[model samples]
Target: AVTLHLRAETKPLEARAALTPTTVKKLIAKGFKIYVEDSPQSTFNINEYRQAGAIIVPAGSWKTAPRDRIIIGLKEMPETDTFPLVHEHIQFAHCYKDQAGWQNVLMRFIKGHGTLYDLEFLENDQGRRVAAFGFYAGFAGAALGVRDWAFKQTHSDDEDLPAVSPYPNEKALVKDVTKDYKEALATGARKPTVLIIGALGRCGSGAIDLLHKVGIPDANILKWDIKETSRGGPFDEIPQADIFINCIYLSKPIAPFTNMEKLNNPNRRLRTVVDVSADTTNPHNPIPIYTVATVFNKPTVLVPTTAGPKLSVISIDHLPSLLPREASEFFSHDLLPSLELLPQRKTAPVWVRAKKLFDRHCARV
Candidate 1:
């Protein structure tokens, strides 16, 4: 049996989980031993996991778990904790890219001879990510983009779209966004034109789903993907649209989608830029408008365009947290198949690849 322990999330306001009750139940029936921490902050109640047959325990119990058990979590453990990691971990460590303080993050595992199978890099034979929060990320980003654009039309230039909180469900989110959009239309601001790049992927698909649910007309949406972008950019259509949502995965550098000078078009219609890709700190970040990552409370930052209407960028890194329930369920469901192969992890292609990748990065440190 593959013994698995689901650790409680410690990140503030992060309600999503790496493993849900649904996944826990399925794993249990497969003869897996599952231990779950009581996370007061989780969207799923403790009773749910308890009913799913998980051994209920106090939060942070993973630190003391036996070395034979694999620990699963969604986010990075506290950076302040200096203890060496002694068990195999499956989570998005965010250190492989040489993120700020990458060495320190990886050294803990090295010191304890523990293994890390980074969730972000778990791929299949096709080399595609096995699971990601991208769909909900794009969904949440587009929703906020519409709200910000509507706020621009309905409020004074000095006022910003206020803080936002997670939704109980998708229906509630769509209704709220629809209400804001309608208010903008009532102000005689015609329906906004939205241009979404990378429209074929999961992230972009989610953005379009939200737009459709909010009743944005099909014609008003301009979906662009590799075909349209192969010509390269600073495309004029970007500034011409009322809202531009960027969903592209920034792999290598190409021509920037748009620049400060291009956005200075005196007749620019663009008011909101939702960089759902959100490579904010990357030197090659296509959108050179904002430096700081916005939070759900503040949500956006001014772009400092001198000629056009005031513009703001939404670059929140964790956009899926805005709809934690749906995002957790979706991600957990997709990860189930891979987890089912855990007993044979030593030979499983997915786990083998993830392990190899972890070793490659650790070599650099």
Candidate 2:
């Protein structure tokens, strides 16, 4: 009975299914119900939701849902001219800690209003990434650049820290990855030689940490970057490796991995491939071998720990609610102060105009 009103989406049923059943049960426990509608084509059935006392939206339906009624939005809901809805709401869990350990959110205030930057610090990993991705997707589709500029402006290293050194941060964990990889190579450990393709980026660096966390030997670790090195390395020649991990697509364009298909072993050596990039939504985009998994029958596994819909299955619907206390704790840390500075009392009127259509030659709208 977790009442939810989603946006008028093509996959209405699928969207609802995306919500975890546990989340629905929790909502029912808390007396929450949900509903959904199209943002542009219909007026918000505000009275209905208000009556039901809806609490959170696993996903948002933009203008169709009101500001006050919504407590949390899983994805970045655009504040377009069509639906200029404005209010103060708290979202939980869009990302892990940033370099500065600060939370990320985009808040706007009516004229003469202050800010909501210091609200609370209690959301999740999915919340943070979805917010950024939502903004970027809007930027891609918006003609006026309002969405794009806002995306770039707010997300400019909001979650990242300025690099103190060009080389990888010499944390003990990184040192351990190197040590274990070297040891594995020396010992000829069982498994395909580990390959860290796209090892030149943040996510690749993160993969190193993950492998070490799970006790993957350091000697088995092999890194692949596009840049040339003064010293020779095995990565230059993509030979048979047990596992090839992709961490390069972050903060940069996806590299052409298929060009080295010759190096890929369909039968003898290749075992599993892992892709940690966040660029898989568009099916038509160039796909790397790691994401495809099985080329000639080799088993492939994507690292399930990502920042999007992939997590829905893992966390169920109550990702935020799972740790309601912790979720709200981070939320309150980043949100409470921000809302105090700028209450949800004020909002400006948004202007929207539909283009005129012609006769035989359908005019643009």
Q: What is the lDDT of residue 156 in candidate 1?
A: 93
lDDT of 2 by residue, 1-365 (tens): 12333343221111211122333343444555544332221112334334434333333444454444433333333323222225333332222223121122221222212122111232233333211221111111111111111222233323211111111122432343344444544555453355665555544555565565445567877776666322323333333555545443433244444332443333334323344442433343223333332111111223233221110001011112212222323333333222222222233111000001011111110
Candidate 2 ranges beyond 4 A from true positions: 1-71, 76-192, 198-202, 225-239, 250-255, 263-268, 278-287, 290-365
TM-scores, all models, native as reference: 0.96, 0.35
- Tell me the whole-model lDDT of each prediction, alpha carbons only: 0.92, 0.32
lDDT of 1 by residue, 45-159 (tens): 8899999999998999999989999999999898788988999999999999889988988899999899999999999899999999989999999999999999999999999
Clash list (residue pairs), candidate 1: none
Clashes of 1: 0
Top-lDDT candidate index: 1
The TM-score, computed over Cα atoms with residue i paired to residue i, of candidate 2 is 0.35
Prediction-by-prediction clash tally: 0, 54
